[PDB]
């Protein structure tokens, strides 16, 4: 039954581990399909966007410190939307893309666009916006895989930039938050049972406040799994709140100005109603659009047919290796379709190619977003979708 499957999976993984050394990466190593969930990393990112109400609360909050707390709430709430067993998303192919949208209770929509911008090393970029609430998010995921011995990790070097476009700072620019990502570990691979943990530091920074949240690992006897600990501070040394609890259970916030008060409930992740993204019908999706590209693999995963899932996945990744070979032969390199390389000194490697003026009518912003890629039912690809972003910005100003 399943104890026999578990033993054979255990052996398969030991046979991979046997040929490694702590500190080296897993980019060359193919992991088995039975540790895959049925979504691409491009879609997995949208798990973290499933609580837009906290972001809407942040946007309407006048007090800067309280607004920061709501941003922290929005960002922490997404992490527990995650697979239950030891599973990871499919690694996207170079140029794979995924679009999705949300129908928000306030009759507005949220839009999401993403693309895998690099394979060596892996990187994807994503863009998310709620134009009628003046909310814009840009980010990149940069996972650097590492075998560590009894554990392995995705060292998460990406980051996220959140802007409230109609909340201006002293320079008359939108209020900006930069949010980093903790690392994702699997521990117990050598002498235990595998379990996924978050670890190390998550940094959230705004113009006037900052929070360094440590994702702790359990002690031998003391502590719990999934514990977090951090302090909300200004840039002048003043500590205002302490966050504690567990990122997949209840998180607590203690007011540090009142030493007698007790930590109060900040986030109870089992009492939250996530808002899942919507996606265009499969019949309208492109060849390298995530759900369509991986449909044969995920169908086999859903019926636990791992020989077929392994073969279908191999054919996709082998085709990508051949395409990469052809690029070398042609003397060219890949360039993303939807994201332009950022200018030096900025927080992100890549930004969506389309210019979206910060203060223009949100109906014009929505129209510009919908021109980037098919998001809503009925939208069609154009010829221009498939040319590089750097050629689309040349024409975005050549006619001007």
């Amino acid at each position: 039954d399943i104890d026999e499957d578990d033993e054979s999976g255990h052996n398969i993984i030991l046979n991979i581990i046997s040929q490694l050394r702590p500190g080296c990466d897993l980019t060359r190593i193919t992991l088995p399909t039975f540790i895959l969930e049925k979504k691409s990393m491009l879609e997995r990112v949208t798990n973290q966007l499933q609580f837009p109400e906290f972001l809407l609360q942040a946007h309407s909050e006048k007090d800067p410190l309280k607004r920061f707390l709501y941003v922290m709430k929005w960002y922490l709430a997404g992490w527990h939307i995650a697979p239950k067993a030891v599973k990871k998303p499919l690694n996207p192919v170079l140029g794979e893309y995924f679009t999705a949208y949300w129908d928000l209770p306030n009759k507005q929509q949220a839009y999401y666009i993403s693309e895998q911008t690099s394979h060596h090393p892996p990187e994807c970029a994503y863009f998310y916006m709620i134009p009628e609430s003046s909310i814009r998010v840009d980010g990149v995921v940069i996972p650097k895989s590492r075998f560590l011995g009894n554990s392995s990790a995705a060292m998460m070097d990406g980051s996220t930039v959140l802007q409230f476009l109609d909340i201006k700072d002293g320079n008359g620019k939108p209020e900006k938050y930069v949010l980093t990502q903790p690392n994702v570990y699997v521990r117990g691979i050598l002498f235990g049972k595998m379990r996924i943990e978050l670890g190390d530091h998550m940094i959230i920074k705004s113009p006037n406040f900052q929070a360094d949240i440590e994702f702790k690992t359990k002690g031998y006897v003391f502590g719990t799994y999934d514990a977090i600990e951090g302090t909300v501070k200004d840039y002048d040394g003043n500590a205002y709140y302490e966050i504690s609890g567990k990122w997949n259970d209840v998180m607590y916030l203690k007011d540090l100005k009142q030493p007698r008060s007790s930590p109060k409930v900040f986030l109870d992740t089992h009492k939250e109603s996530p808002l899942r993204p919507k996606v265009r019908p499969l019949s309208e999706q492109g060849e390298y659009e995530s759900r369509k590209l991986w449909k044969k693999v995920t169908d086999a995963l859903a019926v636990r047919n791992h020989p077929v899932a392994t073969e279908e996945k191999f054919q996709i990744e082998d085709h990508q290796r051949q395409l990469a070979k052809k690029r070398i032969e042609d003397g060219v390199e890949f360039h993303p379709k939807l994201f332009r390389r950022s200018k030096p000194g900025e927080d992100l490697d890549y930004c969506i190619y389309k210019n979206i003026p910060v203060d223009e009518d949100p109906e014009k912003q929505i129209r510009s977003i919908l021109q980037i890629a098919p998001i809503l039912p009925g939208q069609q690809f154009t010829d221009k979708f498939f040319i590089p972003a750097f050629e689309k910005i040349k024409s975005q100003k050549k006619m001007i």
């Binding site: 949100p362 109906e363 919908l370 221009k384 498939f386 689309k392």
Partner: peptide
């Protein structure tokens, strides 16, 4: 430059009563 065709009416909250 547009990579996608638009819906006939750009959706907003100000025309959701129609939709």
């Amino acid at each position: 430059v547009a990579g996608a065709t638009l819906p006939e009416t750009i959706p907003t909250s100000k025309n959701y009563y129609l939709r």
